[PDB]
Design a protein around this ligand. Structure first.
Ligand SMILES: *[C@@H]1O[C@H](CO)[C@@H](O)[C@H](O)[C@H]1NC(C)=O
Length: 194
């Protein structure tokens, strides 16, 4: 009977950074996706392996929603088979993805004033993430001749960097909130339905 907790995902006070992104799991509820597709707010809402006008017919073994903030020029990396620092080192979707990516401009709800809130992404890593791997470690990264094995210095870097949004200005570099819905089809009792 109960409506699913999408309000706890889409209307939260602050969304996470793109390293250390939030994940919500959704179960034992009715998921009406019609109020998502017919909401006016969304700048992108792209679905893979399901079509949005049919989500209200389907039932899923379990549902996940992942949420974070990125610049409007990075949202193209939030798709299967993409490449770049976000897709490699911060958040990766598998090549065989069943789910939808939803994004909207948040420059009214965030970045509205002087200073900043501390949004960080990982810029350096020794190898790519696996699909849905999350990495929150902040050990020094080596980037040159000889190990530093300690303090920051010549050819060693702290792995995180700030996004550098334009100061309540610009055009493409503004903040976009993202929610990624991922749907399971494992042969067990269907915990979410339309
Ligand atoms: C977010 O809040 C608005 C305004 O209260 C509401 O219309 C919308 O349904 C909420 N989002 C979800 C996913 O329910």
């Amino acid at each position: 009977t109960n409506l699913c907790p999408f309000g706890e995902v889409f209307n939260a006070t602050r969304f996470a950074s793109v390293y250390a992104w939030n994940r919500k799991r959704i179960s034992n509820c009715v998921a009406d996706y019609s109020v998502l597709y017919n909401s006016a707010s969304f700048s992108t809402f792209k679905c893979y392996g399901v079509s949005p006008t049919k989500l209200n017919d389907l039932c899923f073994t379990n549902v996940y929603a992942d949420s974070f903030v990125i610049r409007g020029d990075w949202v193209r990396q939030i798709a299967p088979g993409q490449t770049g620092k976000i897709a490699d080192y911060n958040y990766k979707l598998p090549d065989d993805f069943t789910g939808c990516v939803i994004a909207w401009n948040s420059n009214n709800l965030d970045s509205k004033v002087g200073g900043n809130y501390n949004y960080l992404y990982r810029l350096f890593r020794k190898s790519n993430l696996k699909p849905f791997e999350r990495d929150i470690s902040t050990e020094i990264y080596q980037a040159g001749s000889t190990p530093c094995n300690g303090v920051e210095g010549f050819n060693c870097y702290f792995p995180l960097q700030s996004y550098g949004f334009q100061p309540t200005n610009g055009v493409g570099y503004q903040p976009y909130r993202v929610v990624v819905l991922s749907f399971e089809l494992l042969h067990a009792p269907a915990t979410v339905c339309g």
